[model samples]
Target: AQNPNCNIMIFHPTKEEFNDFDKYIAYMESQGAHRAGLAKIIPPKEWKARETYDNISEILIATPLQQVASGRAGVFTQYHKKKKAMTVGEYRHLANSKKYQTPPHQNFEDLERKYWKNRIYNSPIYGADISGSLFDENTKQWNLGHLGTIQDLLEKECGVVIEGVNTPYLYFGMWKTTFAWHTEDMDLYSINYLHLGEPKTWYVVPPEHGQRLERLARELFPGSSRGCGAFLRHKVALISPTVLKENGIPFNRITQEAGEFMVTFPYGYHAGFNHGFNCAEAINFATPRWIDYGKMASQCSCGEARVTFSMDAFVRILQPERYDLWKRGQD
Candidate 1:
């Protein structure tokens, strides 16, 4: 899935300007980026999805608990302290445990400046996973909203669509809240759309430089791994633009505004800082290119072979042939 020779494309859907949703899809297909382009599709101003999710708070308040009964939400505090995750029931109890609450904020602009800021209570209450339950079904209908339709294509190829896990998560962030460096599940592609709120600045590294960045991070912190880095004074932490520019590491800086989307390629290492309070929705998708990486991420442990020990059973369904291989015996 790591197309080291391919270039990254942040498509604006604007070559001729979208006359219709079909035209946009036509353009993407024409470019071949959708298959393994290392690309992102930025919807146009007239795009229907721009307004579909802007009223985010209303969705959450009106969303009944039973709808999201199985959804696991996160509880956040300064420095991602304790970094606890719970079901909606537990999150409700924690809320009931307190009558009124408001997490604090900070003023982080870049990677280095972040460590010195007043880093307190800057993360989302339910970070990165308020999916199908929190949102209405209408979202899946819009062009920008339904980036995962490609799963249908992959489904045709594989005879089933590997459930696009680790995605379609509703994200909330205030000043300083961060989703640390990581890649997507099975190295599937990621698409992020800012429904409403302040912009989120992204620092991304391709597979080319990701290894060195991780090595350097480990050099800095012994406990370093890919997804969550070592957080000091509880939790906090990248590659520098100046050094990378001087050294010519393949890197990109993007400040994602409202009504825009960003894609993370397979083996793309990404990290970001929020400018202010904002809500966004993101999803992961796979092409045929993803099969090998899915197997690899499924097998990974401590980032070896792009390894993951977090969810073994689910990995099998995503890579069932590998499961069959294990039964047949390893080569």
Candidate 2:
């Protein structure tokens, strides 16, 4: 196994210091324009005074997977109509409902039983929603087009250029998965802000660390169906105020309405854990600009065949027409 030439950096800023939006934005732009880190932006006192966290709790408690399915399907359909690809929203609506019953290939009865069984045991893998809608307001019309708008703002304000912001074929929705650690198809730079709880555990291993993990996995699991070689190639870096600093990784500890940060690793290996709680909100984006191609040099030595076709095969199967846009490599 080999390591990619990559860099991981963290930034920690106090909430009070970030009160001036323009000043904070300028400070971010100055930190090696190509690098990604976090920014802690304190919200207005009034907004913080509102019980947004309580509202989040209520929604999590009251909403059923089926209801989420309905909303997602409706929103996606609305999005498709805006693009003029589909005349009716019914199919999208049905797809949302079908998503919960079972794997897309399974029957409704089987899915319902699985859902209930998992619910009783308090399992974390039950389906909910992992679509783009998680980033938008569900009470209003689904504005899928905003994806582009967000990208534009990042480029204009943050000096980070992103491609494919507002393409109709873009798939944006929340996915429900249980303790799954997966990588994105594109290079992603992300920023996360934890709210209403103590910090959970997060890992960010650079390429050098990743190679070591891969070697260990191969020796320990040899020919076992258990390990994915690519999974072992990246180092695991934990994200915590103290742990990150101890490890010489930079990060900002935020205590306020919301904390924000930026990440610039392309296809980086990362995961998080929230002991007592199991919820988080993250803002992730991909860039068309490949500023660090050499950084991926280590990825080639993993011996894992580049399974690009399988990367997003399901989306292609479900929405073949959207495949071209996804494969076009941004913009």
Q: Best by TM-score, which number?
A: 1
lDDT of 2 by residue, 165-266 (tens): 322221111122222222333334444433333223334445224434344434433542143434333221112223334445432221222232334244
On residues 195-234, what C-alpha lDDT tens digit does candidate 1 reach at each position? 6666677767765565655555454445534433422212
Q: Assess the local accuracy of residue 105 in candidate 2 as a C-alpha lDDT between 0 and 100.
A: 19
**Cα RMSD for predicted model 2:** 14.0
Candidate 1, pairs of clashing residues: 78-121, 168-283, 231-235, 300-307, 300-308, 301-307
Backbone clashes, each candidate: 6, 35
Local distance difference test values of all predictions, in order: 0.50, 0.32
- TM-score (C-alpha) between model 1 and the true structure: 0.60
Question: Model 1, which residues run further than 4 Å from truth?
Answer: 1-8, 14-40, 50-55, 58-79, 82-126, 133-154, 160-167, 224-249, 298-314, 317-331
